[PDB]
Every structure is written in structure tokens, then in C-alpha cells.
């Protein structure tokens, strides 16, 4: 009866029908939310209590990805906030550590030249006698 007024609004922040369509084509949904924060890699995190619990907090993947978005691109900083483990975004909590050995996030790399492959981590135990010397 009055969802159009919401619908027009979604366009305005979207940037006109042209950017609205690309948003719909990408996220498969148009939703109103407040930008909670931005991670190191460009993903923008939104929140709106209007929606029900599961759909309450959502993420916009970085534009350059454009269709390779994965569930595994979420860095550990925001990971808890995104799965409702906490109600406190990383900006609003000071209990996060900043150790020097922490590593930047990475995808799950499978079927790729960058994948994992196991190997025994122990050098061989028995030494063979060398005849040459």
C-alpha cells in the first residue's frame, strides 16, 4: 500500500535505477540499512533491526569481486559480529588484540595453484652410513 515510498528510497541511496538494477542483480535483494563499518578490504557491513533476526545484519562484498563473493571473504575482525556471536562491531570494542604475528585474511583456495598440500613435518630419523666418507 505504501512500500513504493520505501522502494523509491532504496533507489536514491542506490544511485538511480541503473545502480539499483546492478544492486538487485548482485545481491538479489534491496534492503535499507545503516553502514555499521568498513573492513580493511572494502566490504561494507549494514544493520537494520527492522528485519527479522537472521536477516538483521548483512554485508556488501567489495565491488571488484563482482561475482566471486564467497562466505569465506569475511575477515575475523567482523566474523563474530556477522554471525551474531556478539552485538558489538569491531570498532565499538577495544578487547580486540593487535599482535604483530596476526595474518591478513584469505579465501578458501581449492582447485587453485595456491592451494594447500600436506607434508610430513619431521626430518627423517635414521641416517645411512656414507661410504664415500
Ligand X SMILES: CCCCCCCCCCCCCCCCCC(=O)OC[C@H](COP(=O)([O-])OCC(O)COP(=O)([O-])OC[C@@H](COC(=O)CCCCCCCCCCCCCCCCC)OC(=O)CCCCCCCCCCCCCCCCC)OC(=O)CCCCCCCCCCCCCCCCC
Which stretches of the chain bind ligand X, using CB under 6 A?
A: 22, 25, 66
CB of 66 to ligand X, least distance (A): 6
- Using CB under 8 A, pick the residue from 11, 86, 89, 91 that binds other proteins: 86
Beta strands, E only, 25-91? 34-38, 44-47, 57-60
Q: Is 49 helix (H, G, I), strand (E, B) or coil?
A: coil
CB of 43 to ligand X, least distance (A): 18
Residues 18-77 that bind other proteins (CB under 8 A): 27-29, 40-42, 49-73, 76-77
Asked whether the beta carbons of 30 and 23 are under 8 A apart, the reply is yes
| Helices and strands: H and E segment counts in the chain | 3, 3
Residue 94 binds other proteins, judged by CB under 8 A: no
Please list the residues that pair with 38 across neighbouring strands: 44
The option from ligand X, other proteins, none interacting with 132 (CB < 5 to 8 A, set by class) reads none
Toward other proteins, which CB reaches closer, 103 or 133?
103
- Using CB under 8 A, pick the residue from 30, 79, 89, 91 that binds other proteins: 79
> Cβ–Cβ contacts within 10 Å for residue 78, how many?
22
The option from ligand X, other proteins, none interacting with 25 (CB < 5 to 8 A, set by class) reads ligand X
Amino acid at each position: 500500500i505504501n512500500r513504493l515510498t520505501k522502494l523509491f528510497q532504496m533507489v536514491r541511496e542506490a544511485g538511480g535505477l541503473k545502480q539499483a538494477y546492478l544492486k538487485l542483480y548482485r545481491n538479489d535483494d534491496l534492503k535499507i540499512g545503516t553502514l555499521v563499518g568498513i573492513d580493511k578490504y572494502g566490504n561494507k557491513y549494514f544493520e537494520n533491526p527492522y528485519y527479522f533476526y537472521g536477516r538483521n545484519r548483512w554485508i556488501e562484498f567489495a565491488p571488484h569481486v563482482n561475482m566471486d563473493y564467497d562466505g569465506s571473504m569475511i575477515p575475523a575482525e567482523w566474523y563474530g559480529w556477522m554471525h551474531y556471536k556478539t552485538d558489538l562491531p569491531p570498532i565499538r570494542d577495544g578487547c580486540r588484540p593487535k599482535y604483530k604475528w596476526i595474518a591478513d585474511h584469505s579465501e578458501n583456495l581449492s582447485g587453485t595453484k595456491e592451494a594447500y598440500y600436506p607434508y610430513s613435518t619431521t626430518p627423517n630419523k635414521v641416517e645411512a652410513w656414507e661410504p664415500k666418507a
